[PDB]
Write a protein that binds this ligand. Structure first.
Ligand SMILES: CCCCCCCC/C=C\CCCCCCCC(=O)OC[C@H](CO)OC(=O)CCCCCCCCCCCCCCC
Ligand SMILES: CCCCCCCC/C=C\CCCCCCCC(=O)OC[C@H](CO)OC(=O)CCCCCCCCCCCCCCC
Ligand SMILES: CC(C)CCC[C@@H](C)[C@H]1CC[C@H]2[C@@H]3CC=C4C[C@@H](OC(=O)CCC(=O)O)CC[C@]4(C)[C@H]3CC[C@]12C
Ligand SMILES: CC(C)CCC[C@@H](C)[C@H]1CC[C@H]2[C@@H]3CC=C4C[C@@H](OC(=O)CCC(=O)O)CC[C@]4(C)[C@H]3CC[C@]12C
Ligand SMILES: [Ca+2]
Ligand SMILES: [Ca+2]
Lengths: 686, 150, 686
């Protein structure tokens, strides 16, 4: 039939006169509005404070149309001015001044929003400044996880409000313009706030996106201020300022601490660092490709000497040469490279040793390797001590360093132990499975692999390889997640297969050539044990597991079929499905990572360059044997900051004026400008 | 403003004797540039990154950032289609050659690569556009078979 | 040093008086302009026909600001009006009326642009209508490959002009408005023009994008007119209109011929076709999936019954049932499936025929399969006959039909050639390599593969498999292209390896188990002959070629090494390089293809449905046993077209008005408008 339509939640309606009054305000007819007001004062026929269907009153209509003439008229007739200031601040106009000067239920603004908060949210420097000129305060948000304060225990009541209110406060404290106007050190404030906001993003699972966005706003603000630097003198004053030695790039270090990657990667900042890095190599990069190689190789070859000189006469031409950051890097890399070469010499077994001697005396090459090992150890020790465990723990490569070193230690221990005991010699075959010498050799091999793969870190120093290394790392996180799923599937099929074939396990002796396992000429007993089943399934992923392993000797057809079917389903789920899915996932991330590859790489490279910029550094083999000042510094920083802020605010405004489209509100404003204009002229001409 | 530029003449800050032109070129305004270039102007030549005399060493010592910005600004000006059109006898060849230079500089000045590369692309596009304006094939021949070498 | 900057493109400058005159026009001061004009007459101090450095003369400056009053003033006085009409058309002003009404080098318009062309390029229905009202003509564009006309064979005079001129005429002829106003069948013309433009895109490689853009424009226009249909009566009148029986969906057919995919996929069009397709099963859409399933199954099962009834008495109710298209589809699919089942039985002991009777008698199963085979071939013949070689050939699947049928014929022939000439029953092992029976079996099997793959065609019918099928087919094209690249890679390495190992070939006898080749337990002589080399490299892509195939018996280390290196490089190039690239390529293609799958799928399905809509249809097994009216029809079409064109013009305007930002020029006009008003008011009030 027909669905009747009615207004269910009805609301009071405007009388004809009232409708006309509001209509005049939308047309800007001062005369009619004025008259209506005056008449209302007399005949009391119109509620000056009436409301439109959308809930907007006259003052609100005037504010939106931005007709200050009419606004004044209405205010003079004492119209309810509740929340009007907030609406004006949102419109970002000078009507705010009027309402403030004019001083003394439905709102589009939550009950918590205060004039300053909204101004901050709008980021209008001028309006913010006006409000701040008069005493204004933004509540300090309690520290993350501040239950002690029973005030935080208000979350029990209306948590929604609690959460929103907090976000609103932070959304304000994180306004570039407020930080500019209020904070003493705008840069440091942003750094810190951006971090707290990140932490909150985590704690407040919901509203995470908002906090993260606010954090990025802060980070970009800092970069933008830096970008407004024009001279090196300024850049140095900013990057070397210590809040409270100086000349230690303190602010840059703080940035690295707060993972302010964009700031650390700003072109001008990177330029300064380079000058420090390539000290002594004027235009090293400019040096012809080959030339560079030549110089690097030569210096590397001379690493021991340079090292020795520093050891001999720190204050000598040569002694000073090693102190240069680039030289340190060249030397410290050449040292590691020679270490790896020594390990290679072992492969070729240049110094061959009898395979029968138990715990032989450490071979010649070994001794040579021993120092480097010790040097690396003490190095890590120094790092830990100097940087504190927290920082050392943070570094992921430190884990690899720790592992590599630990393996080298055990290798040595066993080598030693095998010497005191097992002093005699027996045919290797007789040696028990866990003979110390045997175990040591295995540990050594594993360590060698780890050591050589530590060179990946050096890629960060290369313009081409670095970005890739960084991207890979980011993707690795996701790969790990995928691995967990794969593992679960493996375990499942492993349990199942083992459950079916364990009834048919056979003895090694029985097996041909007394060989039992998936690694024998004729694979056998592949699913007999869980340990073996797990191995078999892993190798299947690479196609190295033959299909004949799915048949039982007794030839029970049904079982074998179920077994093959389970193995087959595993192959499909693992190779056809999961493996392929990983490709899709990795493609998705690589795409994203690619967006921010450079900043990531440069942040990483800086960290590396900075490490060498320090003074405590010698290669691993030879590694083991006045308030006045602050006042001036701060004054200068403040001057530079003042200028940077000034030029930043202007830029932002200019960008807006020239890089923003005209929205409908703009049309309405123009239409009103002409309308009010018309009415006035007509009245004058009439 | 144009009108204003006119009035003023009628009666950051990498320099001042040539900054008006440098900015105009960045403003890529043919009219304003026409006005300014009326009075002889001579943009300084950006010395190559190779120099080591106080010519550059001193500056690169006092303010490396300013020096670098200065050179970028000069090039941002020289690579303005308007300036090339007004001041170059063979606008196309200039665009070709300048594009090459602005690329080399991208390699050298790794810090501002993106900036120097944008300018290069700008020059390349300009030349393509000027060719696109050909209408008959006689013109095309004249253009594609012309040499700047005697 | 310094780089001198001098103006070389010297240009004269406007006198102060002149310059001032031009400025007034830009501000809209009619008075000042009027005065200047009058004074110049008497005094002669300013050429009223002067120009800005930007080539903007007064009339032009006025047209752009659209001040018709100033335009009239200027025109009244003797101001050169060259090319002004064209500017007034480009800007799409209707002040063109004034210029047309007046009638008393370095041009921004090529010498070929005539007002009608420019108006067409702008697509302003109004402006175009004005000009067309006065007799106007656009030159004919000589057809593609019209070199015969020495007129075009004289392009030598100026090719670029000829080509450009040609594009300009078409850019005009392909304007939706000109086609609306000047063409009798706007829909047909757009179809045809679209095709020609497509063809030109190919012939004129340069300007390919341009011609292709124009073609899409024509295709979009036709779809849009269709979308303006508001009743099914109109839709029928349009789709069933024959230019010159009627009521045969003629235009729908022409649209399929010209590949007007979008027109065909238009919702309304699809709906009409659906009704025709599902005739006999009203509500089939509402039918529950299960119910549907049931209906389909029953019909398919009874396919033989329905098939016969028709033959016996088409008039019979049952005879009538098979005539319905959807039925035909179902019946014809069942017949094919039955056929495929027959083929499956052939490989079984269903008939358990002997295997040593060279030239055996056809088995019952084979006998039954024969009828179908005959029907399929006959169907093809009819298809060719009823559709012409062109259509038949065009269809890709007709190729497979041909192959399948041809093989199913050679099979028959070879079978016969074997019944004769082979009455014995010698051991299969004694049979020669090319014994006819062996060849026959091979052909039959190959065809059984093709036959079962033809089912993929049926997918187009389903709404889920259809789109997938289409997308994959498109991607196949990409793979084909890659294969060409790979092929060269294969050929290179094939020749190299053959050239290296051909000396070391050995007789099969020498080989173990008298087996020589890659398909032998011990792969041997895999690179000895070229053909083997190609096969071996092909298989190596799938890891079915063992690495021991690269070692020469004599054990010449150098040769073997060169060979292994060559084989390895091939494997890297093919498996690690080309293969991975193909994956990336394909990823991109799918993203794009996916977008147009629907229009691609629906077009495909419609062609399928249309095939059955036709009247000549019986399943393969039982396959082989007035001027007055025209005028009225055309009148109706013209009536509908009139309405559709009107609706289209209005809709396009609305869209242009509701979806177009205010460009800067628009703003300038408003400013000039206020400026003029100001001057006028100031004068009257002053
Ligand atoms: C994430 C984890 C959830 C994913 C869940 C499900 C994924 C689908 C699992 C389907 C596995 C069925 C296959 C098992 C099997 O056939 O055993 C072989 C066993 C081996 O004896 O053979 C059979 O049991 C019967 C022979 C029929 C084999 C054909 C079956 C084809 C099915 C699709 C294969 C897809 C290959 C695509 C490669 C492009
Ligand atoms: C399109 C076609 C153009 C592409 C052109 C070139 C692509 C690069 C070709 C490089 C092929 C060299 C490999 C040949 C070869 O090593 O033979 C093995 C042979 C087998 O005996 O072994 C050797 O000759 C020496 C042993 C060294 C093997 C290590 C070489 C590694 C080189 C890179 C491998 C990349 C694998 C990446 C997988 C993620
Ligand atoms: C490819 C095979 C033979 C393995 C070779 C192992 C090493 C000999 C390679 C692997 C990674 C290389 C390093 C990759 C990164 C760099 C950065 C490179 O510096 C630059 O590229 C730019 C100049 C600068 O470092 O400031 C100095 C050489 C070095 C340490 C390379 C030294 C030689 C390394 C250790
Ligand atoms: C998956 C294995 C067992 C192979 C099975 C082979 C056939 C039994 C399948 C393969 C493709 C199927 C066809 C795919 C497409 C369709 C369209 C389908 O129609 C619809 O999906 C929508 C209704 C409509 O056709 O109008 C009718 C069944 C049919 C012919 C299917 C019938 C059964 C087919 C021939
Ligand atoms: Ca470490
Ligand atoms: Ca066919």
């Amino acid at each position: 039939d027909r669905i009747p339509l009615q207004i269910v939640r009805a609301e009071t309606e405007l009388s004809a006169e009232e409708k006309a009054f509001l209509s005049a305000v939308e047309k800007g007819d001062y005369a009619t509005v004025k008259q209506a007001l005056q008449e209302a004062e007399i005949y009391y026929n119109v509620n000056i404070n009436c409301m439109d269907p959308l809930g907007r009153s006259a003052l609100l209509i005037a504010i939106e149309n931005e007709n200050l003439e009419i606004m004044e008229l209405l205010l003079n007739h004492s119209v309810y001015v509740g929340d009007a200031l907030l609406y004006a601040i949102r419109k970002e106009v000078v009507g705010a001044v009027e309402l403030l000067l004019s001083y003394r239920q439905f709102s589009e603004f939550t009950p918590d929003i205060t004039p300053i908060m909204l101004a901050a949210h709008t980021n209008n420097y001028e309006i913010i400044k006006l409000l701040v000129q008069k005493r204004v305060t933004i509540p300090r948000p309690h520290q993350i996880r501040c239950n002690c304060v029973e005030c935080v225990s208000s979350s029990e009541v209306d948590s929604l409000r609690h959460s929103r209110s907090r976000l609103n406060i932070y959304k304000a404290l994180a306004s570039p313009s407020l930080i500019a106007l209020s904070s003493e050190d705008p840069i440091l404030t942003a750094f810190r706030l951006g971090w707290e906001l990140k932490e909150l993003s985590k704690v407040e699972n919901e509203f995470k996106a908002e906090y993260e966005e606010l954090s990025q706003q802060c980070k970009l603000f800092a970069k933008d201020l830096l970008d407004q630097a024009r001279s090196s003198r300024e850049l140095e004053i900013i990057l070397n300022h210590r809040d409270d030695k100086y000349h230690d790039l303190a602010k840059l270090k703080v940035a690295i601490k707060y993972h302010q990657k964009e700031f650390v990667a700003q072109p001008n900042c990177q330029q300064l660092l380079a000058t420090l890095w390539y000290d002594g190599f004027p235009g090293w990069r400019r040096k012809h490709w080959v030339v560079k190689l030549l110089t690097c190789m030569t210096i590397g070859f001379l690493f021991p000497m340079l090292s020795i000189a520093y050891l001999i006469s720190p204050r000598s031409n040569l002694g000073l040469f090693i102190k240069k950051p680039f030289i340190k890097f060249i030397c410290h890399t050449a040292s590691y490279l020679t270490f790896l070469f020594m390990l290679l010499l072992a492969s070729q077994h240049i110094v061959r040793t009898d395979l029968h001697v138990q715990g032989p005396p450490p071979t010649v090459v070994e001794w040579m390797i021993l120092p480097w090992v010790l040097g690396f150890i003490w190095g890590e020790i120094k790092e830990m001590w100097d940087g504190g465990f927290t920082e050392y723990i943070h570094d992921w490569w430190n884990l690899m360093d720790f592992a590599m070193n630990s393996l080298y230690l055990a290798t040595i221990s066993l080598k030693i132990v095998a010497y005191v005991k097992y002093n005699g010699s027996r045919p290797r075959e007789e040696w028990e499975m866990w003979h110390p010498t045997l175990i040591a050799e295995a540990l050594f091999a594993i360590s060698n692999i780890l050591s050589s793969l530590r060179l990946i870190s050096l890629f960060t120093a290369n313009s081409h390889l670095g970005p890739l290394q960084i991207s890979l790392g980011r993707m690795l996180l996701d790969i790990l997640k995928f691995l967990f799923i794969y593992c679960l599937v493996l375990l499942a099929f492993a349990n199942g297969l083992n459950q079916l074939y364990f009834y048919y396990e056979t003895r090694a002796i029985d097996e041909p050539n007394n060989c039992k396992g998936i690694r024998c000429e004729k694979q056998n007993n592949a699913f007999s044990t869980l340990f073996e089943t797990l191995q078999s399934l892993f190798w299947s992923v690479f196609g190295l597991l033959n299909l004949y392993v799915t048949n039982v000797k007794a030839r029970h057809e049904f079982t074998e079929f179920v077994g093959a079917t389970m193995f087959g389903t595993y192959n499909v789920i693992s190779l056809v499905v999961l493996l392929n899915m990983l490709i899709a996932m990795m493609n998705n991330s690589y795409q994203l990572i690619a967006d921010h590859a450079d900043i990531e790489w440069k942040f990483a490279r800086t960290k590396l360059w900075m490490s060498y910029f320090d003074e405590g550094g010698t290669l691993p083999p030879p590694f083991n044997i006045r308030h006045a000042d602050s006042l001036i510094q701060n004054q200068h920083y403040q001057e530079v900051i003042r200028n940077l802020v000034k030029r930043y605010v202007a830029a932002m405004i200019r960008n807006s004026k020239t890089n923003e489209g005209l929205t409908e509100e703009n049309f309405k404003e123009l239409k009103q400008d002409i309308s009010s204009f018309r009415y006035e002229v007509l009245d004058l001409l009439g | 403003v144009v009108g204003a530029v006119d009035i003023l003449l009628n009666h950051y800050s990498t320099t001042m004797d040539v900054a008006p032109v440098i900015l105009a070129a960045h403003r890529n305004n043919y009219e304003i540039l026409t006005m300014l270039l009326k009075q002889d102007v001579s943009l300084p030549k950006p010395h190559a990154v190779g120099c080591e005399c106080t010519l550059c060493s001193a500056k690169n010592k006092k303010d490396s950032l300013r020096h670098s910005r200065f050179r970028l600004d000069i090039y941002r000006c020289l690579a303005s289609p308007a300036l090339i059109m007004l001041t170059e006898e063979d606008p196309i060849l200039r665009a070709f050659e300048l594009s090459a230079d602005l690329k080399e500089l991208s390699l050298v000045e790794v810090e501002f690569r993106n900036d120097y590369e944008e300018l290069a692309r700008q020059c390349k596009m300009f030349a393509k556009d000027l060719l696109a304006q050909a209408r008959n094939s006689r013109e095309l021949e004249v253009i594609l078979n012309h040499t700047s070498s005697d």
